[PDB]
PDB file of C-alpha atoms in Angstrom:
ATOM      1  CA  UNK V   1      19.595 -13.620 -21.627  1.00  0.00           C
ATOM      2  CA  UNK V   2      20.022  -9.822 -20.423  1.00  0.00           C
ATOM      3  CA  UNK V   3      20.852  -7.597 -23.291  1.00  0.00           C
ATOM      4  CA  UNK V   4      23.084  -5.098 -24.084  1.00  0.00           C
ATOM      5  CA  UNK V   5      21.352  -1.986 -22.989  1.00  0.00           C
ATOM      6  CA  UNK V   6      19.566  -3.540 -20.628  1.00  0.00           C
ATOM      7  CA  UNK V   7      23.138  -4.421 -18.692  1.00  0.00           C
ATOM      8  CA  UNK V   8      24.021  -0.054 -18.100  1.00  0.00           C
ATOM      9  CA  UNK V   9      20.170  -0.046 -16.326  1.00  0.00           C
ATOM     10  CA  UNK V  10      20.930  -2.509 -13.838  1.00  0.00           C
ATOM     11  CA  UNK V  11      21.780  -0.356 -10.664  1.00  0.00           C
ATOM     12  CA  UNK V  12      21.706   3.411  -9.976  1.00  0.00           C
ATOM     13  CA  UNK V  13      22.724   5.572 -12.617  1.00  0.00           C
ATOM     14  CA  UNK V  14      23.187   9.382 -12.212  1.00  0.00           C
ATOM     15  CA  UNK V  15      21.719  11.680 -14.563  1.00  0.00           C
ATOM     16  CA  UNK V  16      22.506  14.517 -16.270  1.00  0.00           C
ATOM     17  CA  UNK V  17      19.943  16.951 -18.011  1.00  0.00           C
ATOM     18  CA  UNK V  18      20.260  20.002 -20.405  1.00  0.00           C
ATOM     19  CA  UNK V  19      17.866  22.046 -22.269  1.00  0.00           C
ATOM     20  CA  UNK V  20      17.874  25.009 -24.161  1.00  0.00           C
ATOM     21  CA  UNK V  21      14.979  26.938 -24.984  1.00  0.00           C
ATOM     22  CA  UNK V  22      13.249  30.030 -25.924  1.00  0.00           C
ATOM     23  CA  UNK V  23       9.509  31.164 -25.793  1.00  0.00           C
ATOM     24  CA  UNK V  24       8.177  33.858 -27.927  1.00  0.00           C
ATOM     25  CA  UNK V  25      11.725  34.789 -27.633  1.00  0.00           C
ATOM     26  CA  UNK V  26      12.601  34.670 -24.600  1.00  0.00           C
ATOM     27  CA  UNK V  27      15.837  32.506 -23.869  1.00  0.00           C
ATOM     28  CA  UNK V  28      16.055  30.728 -20.605  1.00  0.00           C
ATOM     29  CA  UNK V  29      18.673  27.944 -19.782  1.00  0.00           C
ATOM     30  CA  UNK V  30      17.785  24.765 -16.953  1.00  0.00           C
ATOM     31  CA  UNK V  31      20.208  22.276 -15.964  1.00  0.00           C
ATOM     32  CA  UNK V  32      19.433  19.640 -13.474  1.00  0.00           C
ATOM     33  CA  UNK V  33      21.181  16.165 -11.881  1.00  0.00           C
ATOM     34  CA  UNK V  34      19.894  13.328 -10.506  1.00  0.00           C
ATOM     35  CA  UNK V  35      20.345  10.071  -9.912  1.00  0.00           C
ATOM     36  CA  UNK V  36      17.778   7.097 -12.070  1.00  0.00           C
ATOM     37  CA  UNK V  37      17.504   2.959 -10.874  1.00  0.00           C
ATOM     38  CA  UNK V  38      15.587   1.927 -13.137  1.00  0.00           C
ATOM     39  CA  UNK V  39      14.941  -1.852 -11.705  1.00  0.00           C
ATOM     40  CA  UNK V  40      12.750  -0.263  -8.919  1.00  0.00           C
ATOM     41  CA  UNK V  41      11.932   3.133 -12.260  1.00  0.00           C
ATOM     42  CA  UNK V  42      12.632   5.595  -9.723  1.00  0.00           C
ATOM     43  CA  UNK V  43      13.915   9.248 -10.601  1.00  0.00           C
ATOM     44  CA  UNK V  44      15.118  11.643  -8.632  1.00  0.00           C
ATOM     45  CA  UNK V  45      16.548  14.991  -9.892  1.00  0.00           C
ATOM     46  CA  UNK V  46      16.626  18.413  -9.552  1.00  0.00           C
ATOM     47  CA  UNK V  47      16.501  21.711 -11.678  1.00  0.00           C
ATOM     48  CA  UNK V  48      17.581  25.045 -11.772  1.00  0.00           C
ATOM     49  CA  UNK V  49      16.780  27.604 -14.045  1.00  0.00           C
ATOM     50  CA  UNK V  50      20.362  29.095 -15.118  1.00  0.00           C
ATOM     51  CA  UNK V  51      19.434  32.042 -16.746  1.00  0.00           C
ATOM     52  CA  UNK V  52      17.588  33.828 -13.765  1.00  0.00           C
ATOM     53  CA  UNK V  53      13.444  33.220 -13.957  1.00  0.00           C
ATOM     54  CA  UNK V  54      11.638  30.915 -16.036  1.00  0.00           C
ATOM     55  CA  UNK V  55       9.730  32.165 -18.252  1.00  0.00           C
ATOM     56  CA  UNK V  56       7.005  29.369 -18.539  1.00  0.00           C
ATOM     57  CA  UNK V  57       5.612  27.186 -15.973  1.00  0.00           C
ATOM     58  CA  UNK V  58       8.172  24.656 -14.287  1.00  0.00           C
ATOM     59  CA  UNK V  59       5.153  21.395 -15.026  1.00  0.00           C
ATOM     60  CA  UNK V  60       5.018  22.920 -18.823  1.00  0.00           C
ATOM     61  CA  UNK V  61       8.592  21.233 -18.484  1.00  0.00           C
ATOM     62  CA  UNK V  62       8.632  18.525 -17.016  1.00  0.00           C
ATOM     63  CA  UNK V  63       7.843  15.800 -19.626  1.00  0.00           C
ATOM     64  CA  UNK V  64      10.451  17.515 -21.967  1.00  0.00           C
ATOM     65  CA  UNK V  65      13.033  17.259 -19.198  1.00  0.00           C
ATOM     66  CA  UNK V  67      14.218   9.716 -19.994  1.00  0.00           C
ATOM     67  CA  UNK V  68      12.082   6.972 -20.401  1.00  0.00           C
ATOM     68  CA  UNK V  69      14.800   5.141 -20.466  1.00  0.00           C
ATOM     69  CA  UNK V  70      14.570   4.681 -17.024  1.00  0.00           C
ATOM     70  CA  UNK V  71      11.016   3.022 -16.837  1.00  0.00           C
ATOM     71  CA  UNK V  72      10.678   0.097 -15.056  1.00  0.00           C
ATOM     72  CA  UNK V  73      10.012  -2.973 -17.903  1.00  0.00           C
ATOM     73  CA  UNK V  74       8.463  -5.750 -16.025  1.00  0.00           C
ATOM     74  CA  UNK V  75      10.922  -9.150 -17.118  1.00  0.00           C
ATOM     75  CA  UNK V  76       7.690 -10.724 -19.694  1.00  0.00           C
ATOM     76  CA  UNK V  77       8.064  -7.158 -21.378  1.00  0.00           C
ATOM     77  CA  UNK V  78      11.917  -6.374 -21.353  1.00  0.00           C
ATOM     78  CA  UNK V  79      12.115  -7.729 -25.337  1.00  0.00           C
ATOM     79  CA  UNK V  80       9.885  -4.298 -26.133  1.00  0.00           C
ATOM     80  CA  UNK V  81      12.461  -2.119 -24.299  1.00  0.00           C
ATOM     81  CA  UNK V  82      13.480   0.068 -27.225  1.00  0.00           C
ATOM     82  CA  UNK V  83      15.301   3.076 -24.948  1.00  0.00           C
ATOM     83  CA  UNK V  84      17.203   1.214 -22.756  1.00  0.00           C
ATOM     84  CA  UNK V  85      17.977  -1.415 -26.072  1.00  0.00           C
ATOM     85  CA  UNK V  86      19.591   2.139 -28.143  1.00  0.00           C
ATOM     86  CA  UNK V  87      22.015   2.618 -25.382  1.00  0.00           C
ATOM     87  CA  UNK V  88      24.713   3.678 -24.731  1.00  0.00           C
ATOM     88  CA  UNK V  89      24.799   5.537 -28.407  1.00  0.00           C
ATOM     89  CA  UNK V  90      21.499   6.898 -27.230  1.00  0.00           C
ATOM     90  CA  UNK V  91      17.900   7.997 -29.119  1.00  0.00           C
ATOM     91  CA  UNK V  92      16.851  11.188 -30.314  1.00  0.00           C
ATOM     92  CA  UNK V  93      13.373  12.211 -28.846  1.00  0.00           C
ATOM     93  CA  UNK V  94      11.043  14.627 -30.267  1.00  0.00           C
ATOM     94  CA  UNK V  95       7.948  16.659 -29.847  1.00  0.00           C
ATOM     95  CA  UNK V  96       5.174  19.088 -30.730  1.00  0.00           C
ATOM     96  CA  UNK V  97       3.099  19.899 -27.810  1.00  0.00           C
ATOM     97  CA  UNK V  98       0.232  22.181 -28.220  1.00  0.00           C
ATOM     98  CA  UNK V  99      -0.968  23.802 -26.351  1.00  0.00           C
ATOM     99  CA  UNK V 100      -5.050  24.288 -25.861  1.00  0.00           C
ATOM    100  CA  UNK V 101      -5.656  27.660 -27.079  1.00  0.00           C
ATOM    101  CA  UNK V 102      -2.223  28.929 -26.297  1.00  0.00           C
ATOM    102  CA  UNK V 103       1.513  28.642 -28.595  1.00  0.00           C
ATOM    103  CA  UNK V 104       3.317  25.227 -29.034  1.00  0.00           C
ATOM    104  CA  UNK V 105       6.746  24.121 -27.661  1.00  0.00           C
ATOM    105  CA  UNK V 106       8.889  21.876 -29.941  1.00  0.00           C
ATOM    106  CA  UNK V 107      11.280  20.174 -29.003  1.00  0.00           C
ATOM    107  CA  UNK V 108      14.839  18.059 -30.812  1.00  0.00           C
ATOM    108  CA  UNK V 109      16.726  16.202 -27.547  1.00  0.00           C
ATOM    109  CA  UNK V 110      19.107  13.586 -27.452  1.00  0.00           C
ATOM    110  CA  UNK V 111      19.531  10.643 -24.235  1.00  0.00           C
ATOM    111  CA  UNK V 112      22.448   9.386 -24.662  1.00  0.00           C
ATOM    112  CA  UNK V 113      25.733   7.885 -22.239  1.00  0.00           C
ATOM    113  CA  UNK V 114      28.624  10.464 -21.051  1.00  0.00           C
ATOM    114  CA  UNK V 115      30.470   7.788 -20.116  1.00  0.00           C
ATOM    115  CA  UNK V 116      28.604   6.647 -16.732  1.00  0.00           C
ATOM    116  CA  UNK V 117      26.229   9.616 -16.965  1.00  0.00           C
ATOM    117  CA  UNK V 118      23.137   9.152 -18.579  1.00  0.00           C
ATOM    118  CA  UNK V 119      22.808  12.985 -20.650  1.00  0.00           C
ATOM    119  CA  UNK V 120      19.503  14.276 -21.643  1.00  0.00           C
ATOM    120  CA  UNK V 121      20.499  17.357 -24.119  1.00  0.00           C
ATOM    121  CA  UNK V 122      17.308  19.534 -24.586  1.00  0.00           C
ATOM    122  CA  UNK V 123      16.793  22.784 -27.143  1.00  0.00           C
ATOM    123  CA  UNK V 124      12.866  23.500 -27.535  1.00  0.00           C
ATOM    124  CA  UNK V 125      10.983  26.493 -29.562  1.00  0.00           C
ATOM    125  CA  UNK V 126       7.786  27.741 -28.571  1.00  0.00           C
ATOM    126  CA  UNK V 127       6.289  30.189 -30.156  1.00  0.00           C
ATOM    127  CA  UNK V 128       2.371  31.630 -30.905  1.00  0.00           C
ATOM    128  CA  UNK V 129       1.724  31.837 -27.344  1.00  0.00           C
ATOM    129  CA  UNK V 130      -0.112  34.452 -26.070  1.00  0.00           C
ATOM    130  CA  UNK V 131       1.699  37.298 -23.755  1.00  0.00           C
ATOM    131  CA  UNK V 132      -1.191  37.118 -21.025  1.00  0.00           C
ATOM    132  CA  UNK V 133      -2.177  33.818 -21.283  1.00  0.00           C
ATOM    133  CA  UNK V 134      -1.278  30.717 -18.999  1.00  0.00           C
ATOM    134  CA  UNK V 135       1.669  29.821 -19.279  1.00  0.00           C
ATOM    135  CA  UNK V 136       3.411  33.104 -20.307  1.00  0.00           C
ATOM    136  CA  UNK V 137       1.241  34.654 -17.689  1.00  0.00           C
ATOM    137  CA  UNK V 138       2.391  31.989 -15.188  1.00  0.00           C
ATOM    138  CA  UNK V 139      -1.344  31.117 -14.059  1.00  0.00           C
ATOM    139  CA  UNK V 140      -0.475  27.301 -13.623  1.00  0.00           C
ATOM    140  CA  UNK V 141      -0.978  25.460 -10.773  1.00  0.00           C
ATOM    141  CA  UNK V 142       2.444  23.192  -9.176  1.00  0.00           C
ATOM    142  CA  UNK V 143       1.352  20.287  -9.140  1.00  0.00           C
ATOM    143  CA  UNK V 144       2.003  16.482  -8.916  1.00  0.00           C
ATOM    144  CA  UNK V 145       1.724  14.791 -12.359  1.00  0.00           C
ATOM    145  CA  UNK V 146       0.879  11.304 -13.519  1.00  0.00           C
ATOM    146  CA  UNK V 147      -0.870   9.372 -16.831  1.00  0.00           C
ATOM    147  CA  UNK V 148      -0.826   6.177 -18.869  1.00  0.00           C
ATOM    148  CA  UNK V 149       1.646   6.901 -22.009  1.00  0.00           C
ATOM    149  CA  UNK V 150       0.862   4.303 -24.823  1.00  0.00           C
ATOM    150  CA  UNK V 151       3.708   3.490 -27.015  1.00  0.00           C
ATOM    151  CA  UNK V 152       3.881   1.701 -30.445  1.00  0.00           C
ATOM    152  CA  UNK V 153       6.352   1.109 -32.788  1.00  0.00           C
ATOM    153  CA  UNK V 154       7.604   3.552 -35.734  1.00  0.00           C
ATOM    154  CA  UNK V 155       9.246   0.800 -38.091  1.00  0.00           C
ATOM    155  CA  UNK V 156       9.662   2.758 -40.645  1.00  0.00           C
ATOM    156  CA  UNK V 157      12.140   5.008 -39.048  1.00  0.00           C
ATOM    157  CA  UNK V 158      13.142   2.269 -36.226  1.00  0.00           C
ATOM    158  CA  UNK V 159      12.557   3.797 -33.247  1.00  0.00           C
ATOM    159  CA  UNK V 160       8.613   4.892 -31.477  1.00  0.00           C
ATOM    160  CA  UNK V 161       6.122   6.986 -31.255  1.00  0.00           C
ATOM    161  CA  UNK V 162       3.678   8.272 -28.520  1.00  0.00           C
ATOM    162  CA  UNK V 163       0.903  10.676 -28.323  1.00  0.00           C
ATOM    163  CA  UNK V 164      -0.578  12.405 -25.278  1.00  0.00           C
ATOM    164  CA  UNK V 165      -2.408  14.423 -22.990  1.00  0.00           C
ATOM    165  CA  UNK V 166      -1.164  16.389 -20.410  1.00  0.00           C
ATOM    166  CA  UNK V 167      -4.096  18.234 -18.446  1.00  0.00           C
ATOM    167  CA  UNK V 168      -2.473  21.076 -16.166  1.00  0.00           C
ATOM    168  CA  UNK V 169      -4.066  22.609 -13.717  1.00  0.00           C
ATOM    169  CA  UNK V 170      -4.831  26.976 -13.539  1.00  0.00           C
ATOM    170  CA  UNK V 171      -5.213  28.575 -10.544  1.00  0.00           C
ATOM    171  CA  UNK V 172      -8.982  29.193 -11.383  1.00  0.00           C
ATOM    172  CA  UNK V 173     -10.045  25.419 -11.319  1.00  0.00           C
ATOM    173  CA  UNK V 174      -9.692  25.058 -14.996  1.00  0.00           C
ATOM    174  CA  UNK V 175      -7.192  22.828 -16.969  1.00  0.00           C
ATOM    175  CA  UNK V 176      -4.585  23.659 -20.025  1.00  0.00           C
ATOM    176  CA  UNK V 177      -4.285  21.399 -22.207  1.00  0.00           C
ATOM    177  CA  UNK V 178      -1.332  19.954 -23.580  1.00  0.00           C
ATOM    178  CA  UNK V 179      -1.454  17.873 -26.761  1.00  0.00           C
ATOM    179  CA  UNK V 180       2.553  15.741 -27.119  1.00  0.00           C
ATOM    180  CA  UNK V 181       3.223  14.199 -30.512  1.00  0.00           C
ATOM    181  CA  UNK V 182       6.612  11.903 -29.758  1.00  0.00           C
ATOM    182  CA  UNK V 183       8.459  10.468 -32.322  1.00  0.00           C
ATOM    183  CA  UNK V 184      11.881   8.304 -31.077  1.00  0.00           C
ATOM    184  CA  UNK V 185      15.015   7.360 -33.343  1.00  0.00           C
ATOM    185  CA  UNK V 186      18.515   5.995 -32.593  1.00  0.00           C
ATOM    186  CA  UNK V 187      21.400   7.444 -32.570  1.00  0.00           C
ATOM    187  CA  UNK V 188      23.152   4.674 -34.070  1.00  0.00           C
ATOM    188  CA  UNK V 189      22.851   2.056 -36.397  1.00  0.00           C
ATOM    189  CA  UNK V 190      23.096  -0.655 -34.267  1.00  0.00           C
ATOM    190  CA  UNK V 191      19.998  -3.219 -33.026  1.00  0.00           C
ATOM    191  CA  UNK V 192      16.980  -2.065 -31.382  1.00  0.00           C
ATOM    192  CA  UNK V 193      14.041  -3.333 -29.940  1.00  0.00           C
ATOM    193  CA  UNK V 194      10.706  -2.594 -31.645  1.00  0.00           C
ATOM    194  CA  UNK V 195       7.549  -3.411 -28.969  1.00  0.00           C
ATOM    195  CA  UNK V 196       4.298  -4.385 -28.990  1.00  0.00           C
ATOM    196  CA  UNK V 197       1.693  -2.070 -28.087  1.00  0.00           C
ATOM    197  CA  UNK V 198       2.317  -1.199 -24.221  1.00  0.00           C
ATOM    198  CA  UNK V 199       1.342   1.770 -21.735  1.00  0.00           C
ATOM    199  CA  UNK V 200       4.410   3.772 -19.156  1.00  0.00           C
ATOM    200  CA  UNK V 201       2.765   4.810 -16.412  1.00  0.00           C
ATOM    201  CA  UNK V 202       4.238   8.179 -14.636  1.00  0.00           C
ATOM    202  CA  UNK V 203       4.070   9.872 -11.644  1.00  0.00           C
ATOM    203  CA  UNK V 204       5.670  13.228 -10.788  1.00  0.00           C
ATOM    204  CA  UNK V 205       6.186  14.842  -7.802  1.00  0.00           C
ATOM    205  CA  UNK V 206       6.989  18.597  -7.570  1.00  0.00           C
ATOM    206  CA  UNK V 207       9.261  20.317  -4.621  1.00  0.00           C
ATOM    207  CA  UNK V 208      10.732  22.854  -3.575  1.00  0.00           C
ATOM    208  CA  UNK V 209      14.633  22.691  -2.263  1.00  0.00           C
ATOM    209  CA  UNK V 210      13.833  25.477   1.203  1.00  0.00           C
ATOM    210  CA  UNK V 211      17.316  26.335   0.709  1.00  0.00           C
ATOM    211  CA  UNK V 212      17.589  27.129  -3.019  1.00  0.00           C
ATOM    212  CA  UNK V 213      17.132  30.342  -3.773  1.00  0.00           C
ATOM    213  CA  UNK V 214      17.394  30.001  -7.934  1.00  0.00           C
ATOM    214  CA  UNK V 215      13.956  29.305  -9.672  1.00  0.00           C
ATOM    215  CA  UNK V 216      13.648  25.595  -9.262  1.00  0.00           C
ATOM    216  CA  UNK V 217      12.243  22.125  -9.661  1.00  0.00           C
ATOM    217  CA  UNK V 218      12.501  19.454  -6.959  1.00  0.00           C
ATOM    218  CA  UNK V 219      11.229  16.299  -8.799  1.00  0.00           C
ATOM    219  CA  UNK V 220      10.591  12.445  -7.473  1.00  0.00           C
ATOM    220  CA  UNK V 221       9.296  10.165 -10.465  1.00  0.00           C
ATOM    221  CA  UNK V 222       8.468   6.262 -10.855  1.00  0.00           C
ATOM    222  CA  UNK V 223       7.638   5.730 -14.553  1.00  0.00           C
ATOM    223  CA  UNK V 224       6.370   1.060 -15.157  1.00  0.00           C
ATOM    224  CA  UNK V 225       5.532   0.165 -18.200  1.00  0.00           C
ATOM    225  CA  UNK V 226       2.482  -2.574 -18.816  1.00  0.00           C
ATOM    226  CA  UNK V 227      -0.070  -3.769 -20.999  1.00  0.00           C
ATOM    227  CA  UNK V 228       0.781  -6.275 -21.912  1.00  0.00           C
TER     228      UNK V 228
END
Protein backbone atom coordinates (compact mmCIF):
# COMPACT_ATOMS: atom_id res chain seq x y z
CA UNK A 1 0.00 0.00 0.00
CA UNK A 2 1.03 3.63 -0.53
CA UNK A 3 2.70 5.28 2.51
CA UNK A 4 1.73 8.46 4.33
CA UNK A 5 4.71 10.63 3.43
CA UNK A 6 5.06 9.17 -0.10
CA UNK A 7 1.53 10.43 -0.95
CA UNK A 8 2.65 14.08 -0.44
CA UNK A 9 4.99 13.75 -3.47
CA UNK A 10 2.77 12.18 -6.17
CA UNK A 11 2.33 15.49 -8.00
CA UNK A 12 4.33 18.68 -8.57
CA UNK A 13 5.33 20.28 -5.27
CA UNK A 14 6.46 23.93 -4.85
CA UNK A 15 9.84 24.31 -3.21
CA UNK A 16 11.33 27.16 -1.16
CA UNK A 17 14.98 27.18 -0.09
CA UNK A 18 16.47 29.71 2.36
CA UNK A 19 20.19 29.74 3.36
CA UNK A 20 21.96 31.97 5.78
CA UNK A 21 25.71 31.69 5.44
CA UNK A 22 28.91 32.92 7.04
CA UNK A 23 32.21 31.82 5.44
CA UNK A 24 35.33 33.28 7.11
CA UNK A 25 33.09 36.14 8.33
CA UNK A 26 31.71 36.83 4.83
CA UNK A 27 27.98 36.82 5.53
CA UNK A 28 25.40 36.14 2.84
CA UNK A 29 21.88 34.88 2.21
CA UNK A 30 20.39 32.85 -0.62
CA UNK A 31 16.75 32.27 -1.51
CA UNK A 32 15.55 29.68 -4.00
CA UNK A 33 12.23 28.81 -5.57
CA UNK A 34 10.92 26.21 -7.95
CA UNK A 35 9.20 22.85 -8.16
CA UNK A 36 9.85 19.17 -7.60
CA UNK A 37 8.22 16.16 -9.27
CA UNK A 38 9.42 13.06 -7.46
CA UNK A 39 7.60 10.76 -9.84
CA UNK A 40 10.38 11.72 -12.33
CA UNK A 41 13.03 12.68 -9.78
CA UNK A 42 12.92 16.16 -11.30
CA UNK A 43 13.85 19.51 -9.70
CA UNK A 44 13.68 22.93 -11.38
CA UNK A 45 15.02 25.77 -9.20
CA UNK A 46 16.36 29.31 -9.33
CA UNK A 47 18.52 30.66 -6.52
CA UNK A 48 19.33 34.30 -5.83
CA UNK A 49 21.96 35.79 -3.53
CA UNK A 50 19.82 38.37 -1.75
CA UNK A 51 22.71 40.14 -0.03
CA UNK A 52 24.67 41.09 -3.20
CA UNK A 53 27.67 39.13 -4.52
CA UNK A 54 27.94 35.54 -3.38
CA UNK A 55 31.35 35.27 -1.60
CA UNK A 56 31.85 31.61 -2.56
CA UNK A 57 31.31 29.84 -5.89
CA UNK A 58 27.74 28.73 -6.63
CA UNK A 59 28.87 25.15 -7.36
CA UNK A 60 30.07 24.77 -3.76
CA UNK A 61 26.54 25.33 -2.48
CA UNK A 62 24.69 22.94 -4.77
CA UNK A 63 24.72 19.92 -2.45
CA UNK A 64 23.59 22.07 0.49
CA UNK A 65 20.78 23.80 -1.42
CA UNK A 66 16.07 18.02 -1.00
CA UNK A 67 16.70 14.31 -1.48
CA UNK A 68 13.01 13.78 -0.72
CA UNK A 69 12.46 14.47 -4.42
CA UNK A 70 14.36 11.34 -5.48
CA UNK A 71 12.58 8.90 -7.76
CA UNK A 72 12.49 5.64 -5.79
CA UNK A 73 11.65 2.62 -7.94
CA UNK A 74 8.51 0.75 -6.90
CA UNK A 75 10.58 -2.18 -5.61
CA UNK A 76 12.61 0.20 -3.37
CA UNK A 77 9.83 2.33 -1.89
CA UNK A 78 10.32 0.78 1.59
CA UNK A 79 13.83 2.33 1.57
CA UNK A 80 12.82 6.01 1.14
CA UNK A 81 13.63 7.55 4.49
CA UNK A 82 13.31 11.09 3.17
CA UNK A 83 9.63 11.03 2.19
CA UNK A 84 8.76 8.83 5.23
CA UNK A 85 9.74 11.67 7.56
CA UNK A 86 7.21 14.05 5.95
CA UNK A 87 5.34 16.24 6.57
CA UNK A 88 7.10 16.83 9.96
CA UNK A 89 10.43 16.60 8.16
CA UNK A 90 14.05 15.86 8.86
CA UNK A 91 17.21 17.58 10.03
CA UNK A 92 20.07 17.28 7.53
CA UNK A 93 23.58 17.99 8.83
CA UNK A 94 26.83 17.92 6.91
CA UNK A 95 30.48 18.68 7.20
CA UNK A 96 32.07 19.43 3.81
CA UNK A 97 35.87 19.37 3.84
CA UNK A 98 37.47 21.21 0.94
CA UNK A 99 40.84 19.56 0.39
CA UNK A 100 43.73 21.92 1.19
CA UNK A 101 41.17 24.54 2.22
CA UNK A 102 38.37 25.22 4.73
CA UNK A 103 35.19 23.40 5.69
CA UNK A 104 31.48 24.05 5.63
CA UNK A 105 29.24 22.85 8.40
CA UNK A 106 25.57 22.90 7.54
CA UNK A 107 22.36 22.30 9.45
CA UNK A 108 19.06 22.26 7.57
CA UNK A 109 15.45 21.45 8.32
CA UNK A 110 13.46 20.04 5.41
CA UNK A 111 9.70 19.98 6.00
CA UNK A 112 6.35 20.99 4.63
CA UNK A 113 4.83 24.43 5.30
CA UNK A 114 1.38 23.78 3.94
CA UNK A 115 1.78 22.58 0.37
CA UNK A 116 5.32 23.98 0.06
CA UNK A 117 8.44 21.87 0.70
CA UNK A 118 10.87 24.14 2.54
CA UNK A 119 14.62 23.64 2.98
CA UNK A 120 15.89 26.09 5.64
CA UNK A 121 19.68 26.05 6.05
CA UNK A 122 22.38 27.55 8.22
CA UNK A 123 25.90 27.30 6.78
CA UNK A 124 29.14 28.11 8.61
CA UNK A 125 32.50 28.05 6.82
CA UNK A 126 35.85 28.37 8.56
CA UNK A 127 39.55 28.06 7.84
CA UNK A 128 39.34 29.04 4.19
CA UNK A 129 42.25 30.57 2.33
CA UNK A 130 41.35 34.06 1.25
CA UNK A 131 43.06 33.46 -2.18
CA UNK A 132 42.17 29.78 -2.46
CA UNK A 133 39.82 28.16 -4.93
CA UNK A 134 36.69 28.98 -2.92
CA UNK A 135 37.14 32.56 -1.68
CA UNK A 136 39.17 33.33 -4.80
CA UNK A 137 36.38 32.13 -7.14
CA UNK A 138 38.53 29.71 -9.16
CA UNK A 139 35.86 27.06 -9.80
CA UNK A 140 34.18 26.44 -13.12
CA UNK A 141 30.40 26.67 -13.41
CA UNK A 142 29.78 23.10 -14.57
CA UNK A 143 27.24 20.32 -14.63
CA UNK A 144 27.57 18.08 -11.46
CA UNK A 145 26.80 14.30 -11.52
CA UNK A 146 27.36 11.61 -8.86
CA UNK A 147 26.18 8.50 -7.04
CA UNK A 148 25.81 8.76 -3.27
CA UNK A 149 25.69 5.66 -1.05
CA UNK A 150 22.97 5.97 1.61
CA UNK A 151 23.12 3.82 4.75
CA UNK A 152 20.90 3.48 7.79
CA UNK A 153 21.95 5.11 11.05
CA UNK A 154 19.78 2.87 13.25
CA UNK A 155 20.89 4.41 16.56
CA UNK A 156 19.81 7.93 15.37
CA UNK A 157 16.69 6.61 13.66
CA UNK A 158 17.95 8.09 10.42
CA UNK A 159 20.45 7.85 7.60
CA UNK A 160 24.08 8.66 6.91
CA UNK A 161 26.19 9.13 3.81
CA UNK A 162 29.70 10.10 2.84
CA UNK A 163 30.64 11.11 -0.70
CA UNK A 164 33.05 13.12 -2.78
CA UNK A 165 32.30 16.03 -5.07
CA UNK A 166 35.09 17.00 -7.45
CA UNK A 167 34.78 20.63 -8.52
CA UNK A 168 36.64 21.56 -11.67
CA UNK A 169 39.16 24.41 -11.17
CA UNK A 170 39.77 26.97 -13.96
CA UNK A 171 43.35 25.66 -14.44
CA UNK A 172 42.09 22.16 -15.29
CA UNK A 173 42.63 20.67 -11.84
CA UNK A 174 40.12 19.42 -9.21
CA UNK A 175 38.97 20.86 -5.88
CA UNK A 176 37.75 17.93 -3.79
CA UNK A 177 34.83 18.47 -1.40
CA UNK A 178 34.52 15.49 1.00
CA UNK A 179 30.95 15.31 2.36
CA UNK A 180 29.81 13.65 5.59
CA UNK A 181 26.05 13.66 6.10
CA UNK A 182 23.59 12.65 8.84
CA UNK A 183 19.82 12.97 8.73
CA UNK A 184 17.37 12.45 11.59
CA UNK A 185 13.58 12.87 11.80
CA UNK A 186 12.04 16.01 13.32
CA UNK A 187 8.91 14.30 14.48
CA UNK A 188 8.41 11.28 16.73
CA UNK A 189 6.51 9.22 14.10
CA UNK A 190 7.76 6.13 12.30
CA UNK A 191 10.25 6.38 9.50
CA UNK A 192 11.73 3.94 7.00
CA UNK A 193 15.32 2.95 7.72
CA UNK A 194 16.83 1.78 4.42
CA UNK A 195 19.05 -1.02 3.28
CA UNK A 196 22.22 0.25 1.63
CA UNK A 197 21.48 1.88 -1.76
CA UNK A 198 22.48 4.78 -4.04
CA UNK A 199 21.05 8.14 -5.13
CA UNK A 200 22.25 9.08 -8.59
CA UNK A 201 22.08 12.86 -9.24
CA UNK A 202 22.64 14.89 -12.40
CA UNK A 203 22.56 18.68 -12.09
CA UNK A 204 22.82 21.27 -14.89
CA UNK A 205 23.79 24.81 -13.86
CA UNK A 206 22.77 27.80 -15.98
CA UNK A 207 22.02 31.54 -15.91
CA UNK A 208 18.86 33.54 -16.56
CA UNK A 209 19.89 36.09 -19.19
CA UNK A 210 17.39 38.65 -17.77
CA UNK A 211 18.56 38.33 -14.15
CA UNK A 212 20.89 41.04 -12.84
CA UNK A 213 21.23 39.64 -9.31
CA UNK A 214 23.91 37.00 -8.60
CA UNK A 215 22.03 33.75 -9.17
CA UNK A 216 22.00 30.10 -10.24
CA UNK A 217 19.42 28.18 -12.30
CA UNK A 218 19.41 24.47 -11.60
CA UNK A 219 17.82 21.51 -13.40
CA UNK A 220 18.42 18.32 -11.37
CA UNK A 221 17.39 14.68 -11.63
CA UNK A 222 17.69 12.33 -8.64
CA UNK A 223 17.09 8.56 -8.87
CA UNK A 224 17.48 5.78 -6.31
CA UNK A 225 19.14 2.53 -7.34
CA UNK A 226 21.28 -0.39 -6.20
CA UNK A 227 18.69 -2.73 -4.83
